[model samples]
Target: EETRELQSLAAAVVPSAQTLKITDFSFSDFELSDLETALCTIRMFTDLNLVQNFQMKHEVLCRWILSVKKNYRKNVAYHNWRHAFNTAQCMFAALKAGKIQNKLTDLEILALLIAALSHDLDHRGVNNSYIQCHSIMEHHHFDQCLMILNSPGNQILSGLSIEEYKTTLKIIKQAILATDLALYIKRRGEFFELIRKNQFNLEDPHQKELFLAMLMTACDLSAITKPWPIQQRIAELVATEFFDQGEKKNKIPSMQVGFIDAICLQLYEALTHVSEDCFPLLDGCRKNRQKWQALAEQQ
Candidate 1:
């Protein structure tokens, strides 16, 4: 079936996930083909024990990721398949290297990873504001996320009982929809306030949802915090996408400077305080901010 077709295609070209250096924070999605990115997802499943814990069929897993890969619009400059793969990769690194796994359970990690991969499903190269209606594009993305999941031959979570499937579905939907920066901007103020007074509690359900939402933002913007060369390429892509989306002026470097001051530096600095492991992201953002400052100053 479709699974067999993908298995053969993967075996023919990309190295098996076991042999690839895909598990590191240093790995770049820029070099990976969409097919290879799909393979990288399998390794994440292996490490997270997503397949083992959920009792998912191996081929079913393959079909689902391939289907998810197909759902993304490859034509868009920024929110395309490469961006989706990189989003999930950052979550993988945060879970493994940053040990955010220590805070979130297996099911939460599974939901977050799925959310990362599908958050911008069928993106139209623009944000929710650009589309009309309040947050409708995010809703569209989540609907498309469910569309691909419930489609035939691609339900990775179908092995779960009705209750398990339903709960996981809700979590997936929430995480996917929360990717909208409008929602993120509103919720993150509470996140910072909680972190300031040490009132954030993972034990509380609502409090935990806030943390998960912030985690989604951190991973989605993880590009800003990557090492210099990768950050350079990704920001260039971001600028081009902005150019495509009908933004004004030649404020490319200054735009990043504004983004760093208003967005990246704030979130990453708070994340480092919550967990020292998140410091690498904070450190990278700080250095990138300095570089962007000089770049912004250069005519």
Candidate 2:
């Protein structure tokens, strides 16, 4: 029933590009158009040769993204939502590649799509660099980022009813905060190593789990394959992130100036070319994650 409802709601997209319907719930935020497209694309079962767990999937996506806004320190357009939406779009493309076909369930697809959208929803406008260089206590830095997200501050999303708001905030917090590289690399390393070994033991259940992890992390870094103009926009968004922090007298510590660029090159190399040939690029993402992780823990 929910699937049918969601499908019916999805049709509203034809008449109103910015509107999304699920059951009787209709959301008309223009900013959500991209999400609508992603949802609809994955919903048509005839198209995908699969059935998605719609209720679970919808709850996770809707709730998680709203939580990102709930946990975020800012909701301004230039940074958060736009960034997530763009990331989700690229991820959808990656998932649709012939190799991954039918491998991702609708719920998994929705989680990835929504995760991409909300991962940075409540961005603090400061990367880990600012928090570390200032010698601000780790807890303080973490708390500041959290309190903003959970507060009634992100007006765009707070408009939901209190019950809906609370539920959304919870999932969003769990998924978005998971974006911390502290959370990223440990699992990411093991996954990549398996891929490096060409370990495609299809009989291994863990292979499926590893594939999802790699896919999400890949989505987290998906901005590279975006059209050049969008890529340039991403570059600016990242710079603006630093500048916003700079306003608080925060600057990228000289020690880590190359950190961002290095990651960009790593992602480009890994995705654009395949084979054992791309080890350098894969190695670079791993090493850079380690370098930044070490830099943060040193203080």
Which candidate achieves the best lDDT against the true structure?
A: 1
Where's the lowest-lDDT run of ten residues in candidate 1?
9-18
Off by over 4 Å in 1: 1-5, 9-19, 127-133, 245-250
Model 2 local distance difference test score: 0.44
Candidate 2 lDDT, 78-117, residue by residue in tens: 4555555545544544544323445544444544554555
TM-score of 2: 0.50
For 179-296, candidate 1 gives per-residue lDDT tens digits of 8888888888888999999887899999888888888889899899888898899888876676666223356778888888887787888787777887888888888888878877
Root-mean-square deviation of candidate 1:
2.8
Predicted structure 1: lDDT: 0.80
